[PDB]
Swiss-Prot record:
GO biological process entries: amino acid transport; erythrocyte differentiation; glutamine secretion; glutamine transport; L-aspartate import across plasma membrane; L-glutamine import across plasma membrane; neutral amino acid transport; protein homotrimerization
Subunit structure: Homotrimer. Interacts with ERVH48-1/suppressyn; may negatively regulate syncytialization.
Residues that bind Na(+) 2: T312
Taxonomic source organism: Homo sapiens
pH dependence as annotated: Optimum pH is 7.
Record keywords: Acetylation, Amino-acid transport, Antiport, Cell membrane, Glycoprotein, Host cell receptor for virus entry, Host-virus interaction, Membrane, Metal-binding, Phosphoprotein, Receptor, Sodium, Symport, Transmembrane, Transmembrane helix, Transport
Record family assignment: Belongs to the dicarboxylate/amino acid:cation symporter (DAACS) (TC 2.A.23) family. SLC1A5 subfamily.
Protein known as: Neutral amino acid transporter B(0)
Native organism taxonomy: Eukaryota, Metazoa, Chordata, Craniata, Vertebrata
List of residues binding Na(+) 1: G310, N314, N399, D403
Entry keyword Transmembrane helix: yes
Tissue-by-tissue expression: Placenta, lung, skeletal muscle, kidney, pancreas, and intestine. Expressed in CD34-positive hematopoietic progenitors (at protein level).
């Protein structure tokens, strides 16, 4: 089956990239290649990242506009409220699990204010300019006059603000009635034409993933020794992801929906494999919607409203990764964590996951926020960036999975 062959190649691309990067790192690696050859060697991964980032804006905007315009305003409100509750609860559970695992295994045994960060999140939720929000996000810095906070739009897509605007605009189109049907059709057609482009990009995805992983483990120095140093951190992250995706989320699905959760997960295994490969939830969004609608029988209006929102707001993997990283860095620096600091870590990780952009390496940009909020040093992030390519991929799975089951849950609530 060609459809399964594509995903098999996408997954095997990670293994092939690991092998290629280990082979290149041996026999000199970066020093033997030199910057001129290093850039060319790593370029295909960068090209894949560029394509994935390009598709996100139209894909998310059109999908959300259509999904919101496809539901009654009251039904949409109830569904969105329950979906937000599910996302928040699952993210909090992931954060708590990560903190507990980090405190039990102790992987470390071997600046912006928090209020300003939350106000920046609120500002990004309501973009000041729709065109600017497509490639910029509000961010607060300080002038020492007393540190007075002054904000500006820095680079980085404001995907959360565009998501909110898309939902509101879809609701407005629904309320318009016959007059909004033309725009609903326009945005559905744009969404489908974007699904076509995503499907085409998925064919380049294997080569891009291979070269991305190979470059990211060639850039790593002393791969064996660095893995020996970060083994416990990697174990904590992957074990937390496994527990959350295989025990916690299916347990919630079973409790709220007596149907077997693992059959639902098998129904989307292919989207999960694509998410592990590309490490981007948005690239899996088309295939995930297809699988939940076709394999799991989730209604079209539930799926195409929930999954696009969850791909940006619901990131359980990101929250677990950030909590584990925070506790690991605190242990490295020998700072004890109390209930106040643990709760701060949990809340800040939830907010950061909500603010994350859902792109490869998109979860490390906001870990510094947690480290600053807990008064932990920010330099240690240098270590985490080395392992990201692996951990991030795991996160993506637990991210996209968190969406799918949620839809499967909410649909069952509708019935
Ligand atoms: N570490 C993370 O979860 C970042 C986001 C993740 N790469 C995704 O797109 O789902």
């Amino acid at each position: 089956l060609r459809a399964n062959l594509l995903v098999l190649l996408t997954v095997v691309a990670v293994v092939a990239g690991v092998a290629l990067g280990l082979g290149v790192s041996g026999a000199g690696g970066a020093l033997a290649l030199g910057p001129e050859r290093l850039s060319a060697f790593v370029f295909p991964g960068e090209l894949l990242l560029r394509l994935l980032r390009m598709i996100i804006l139209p894909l998310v905007v059109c999908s959300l506009i259509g999904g919101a315009a496809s539901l009654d305003p009251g039904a949409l409100g109830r569904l969105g409220a329950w979906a937000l509750l599910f996302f928040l609860v699952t993210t909090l559970l992931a954060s708590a699990l990560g903190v507990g695992l980090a405190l039990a295994l102790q992987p470390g045994a071997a600046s912006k204010e928090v209020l300003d960060s939350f106000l920046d999140l609120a500002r990004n939720i309501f973009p000041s300019n729709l065109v600017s929000a497509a490639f910029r996000s509000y961010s607060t810095t300080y002038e020492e006059r007393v540190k007075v906070p002054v904000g500006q739009e820095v680079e980085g897509m404001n995907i959360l603000g565009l998501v909110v605007f898309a939902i509101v605009f879809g609701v407005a189109l629904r309320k318009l009635g016959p007059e909004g049907e033309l725009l609903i059709r326009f945005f559905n057609s744009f969404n489908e034409a974007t699904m076509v482009l995503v499907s085409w990009i998925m064919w380049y995805a294997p080569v891009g993933i291979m070269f991305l992983v190979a470059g990211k483990i060639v850039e790593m120095e002393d791969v064996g020794l660095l893995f020996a140093r970060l083994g416990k951190y990697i174990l904590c992250c992957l074990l937390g992801h496994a527990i959350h995706g295989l025990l916690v989320l299916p347990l919630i699905y079973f409790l709220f929906t007596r149907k077997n959760p693992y059959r639902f997960l098998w129904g989307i295994v292919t989207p999960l494999a694509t998410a592990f490969g590309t490490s981007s939830s948005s690239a899996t969004l088309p295939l995930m919607m297809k699988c939940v609608e076709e394999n799991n029988g989730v209604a079209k209006h539930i799926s195409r409203f929930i999954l696009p929102i969850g791909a940006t707001v619901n990131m359980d993997g990101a929250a677990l990764f950030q909590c584990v990283a925070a506790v690991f860095i605190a242990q490295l620096s020998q700072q004890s964590l109390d209930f106040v600091k643990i709760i701060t870590i949990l809340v800040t990780a939830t907010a950061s996951s909500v603010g994350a952009a859902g792109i490869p390496a998109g979860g490390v940009l906001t870990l510094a926020i947690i480290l600053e909020a807990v008064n932990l040093p920010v330099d240690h992030i240098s270590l985490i960036l080395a392992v990201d390519w692996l951990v991030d991929r795991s996160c993506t799975v637990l991210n996209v999975e968190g969406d799918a089951l949620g839809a499967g849950l909410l649909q069952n609530y509708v019935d």
